[PDB]
Amino acid sequence: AKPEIVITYCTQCQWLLRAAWLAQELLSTFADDLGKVCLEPGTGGVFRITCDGVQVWERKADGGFPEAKALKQRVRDRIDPQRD
Amino acid sequence: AKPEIVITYCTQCQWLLRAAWLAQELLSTFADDLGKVCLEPGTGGVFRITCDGVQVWERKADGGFPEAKALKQRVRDRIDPQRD
Amino acid sequence: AKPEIVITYCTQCQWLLRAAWLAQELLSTFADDLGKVCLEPGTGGVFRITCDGVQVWERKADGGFPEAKALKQRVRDRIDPQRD
Amino acid sequence: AKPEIVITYCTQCQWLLRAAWLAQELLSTFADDLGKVCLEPGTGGVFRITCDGVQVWERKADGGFPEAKALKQRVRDRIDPQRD
Structure with a gap:
């Protein structure tokens, strides 16, 4: 079974949009x-x-929301260390 | 445990878009x-x-892709039978 | 200029999602x-x-909302008649 | 006519996603x-x-891509100065 990603978002905060993005x-x-x-x-x-x-990311710890590149890099490091 | 929905889509077919929608x-x-x-x-x-x-849906069986209303109705029936 | 597409959607109806899709x-x-x-x-x-x-599409006339393939075909015919 | 927003995005760069978001x-x-x-x-x-x-925003000038809040604030200032 391949790696599973879970994005937990605040619904009342209207963060579904950015989460689906x-x-x-x-x-x-x-x-x-x-x-x-x-x-x-x-x-x-x-x-x-x-x-x-x-x-791989948490609002408070990482201070806000991830840029797509930054998040992809973090997932890359865990899923396929070597990958440009 | 709240109900879990799984949407399996063909990646090569470019169905990510409609799946995320x-x-x-x-x-x-x-x-x-x-x-x-x-x-x-x-x-x-x-x-x-x-x-x-x-x-709750399968391309061939249901003949194509669901309208949002239709899909919501099927999920409602299984998750909250009584709900307008 | 190139062809301009306009999607007019009912906001209160929560149709932004399908419109953006x-x-x-x-x-x-x-x-x-x-x-x-x-x-x-x-x-x-x-x-x-x-x-x-x-x-290229309206709800009543066309009876609902377009499948992606159907809408693309309709835009195709007007923007690039010959194209698969 | 009400204010018109235009988002110009690099297609080859795969920025459609973040633009639609x-x-x-x-x-x-x-x-x-x-x-x-x-x-x-x-x-x-x-x-x-x-x-x-x-x-209201440009990749190089503003250094990257906008956070939703930041972009909304900039559109608010131009469209409805007084608004939280």
Whole structure:
């Protein structure tokens, strides 16, 4: 089974949009290397992204929201270390 | 555990777009009743949607792709039978 | 100038999602042949699509909402008659 | 006519996704105050956003891509100065 990505986003905060945008950014560049990307509704300003359980991004810790390039780089390092 | 929706789409067919559109259609109308909606890359003209493992749509069987309303109705019937 | 596509959608009806989905479907298959695709907030059950002013789709007339292939075919015929 | 937003994006760069994402971010928070948001295919690393002709963002000048909040703030200042 291929790596699973989970994007937990605050629904009341209207973060579905950016969450689905990032999911598509990932699914289009790692179409072959990803098992599936899940969007998980959450609450309280939550915005976290995990790869096979390992946190790859969290709003507070990383200070905001990821640029597509930065997020792809972090997923690349965990899924396919060597990949330009 | 809230109901999990899985959308398996053909990547080579360029169906990511419509798959992410339907995922957002679902997440915005069932934000509180859905555990998570997953997009799962597949192949060979596949386009299937499951709710807690139960098939709610399949390209061939249902003849094409779902209208948002139709898909929401099928998910409603399984997740919240009584809901206008 | 290149052909301009306008998608007028009912905002209260929550049709922004499907409107943006169709806009992307069009911009990704006709990237070189389209001047620009516009999303225009409308009211009251409105869902109309025009190509250089010529109606290419409306809800009542066409009975619902377009499948991607159908809409692309209609834009094809007006923008590049001969094209698969 | 209401303010028109134009998002010029580099097609070869695969920036349609992020362009459509920002368009939706804008259309959902300014549904009533915007005439229409247009996505305009471009080239050569372009990423520009204008409001009634006035540049509200440009990749090089502003150094990268806008956060939804930042972009909404800039459109707010030009379209409805006083608004939270």
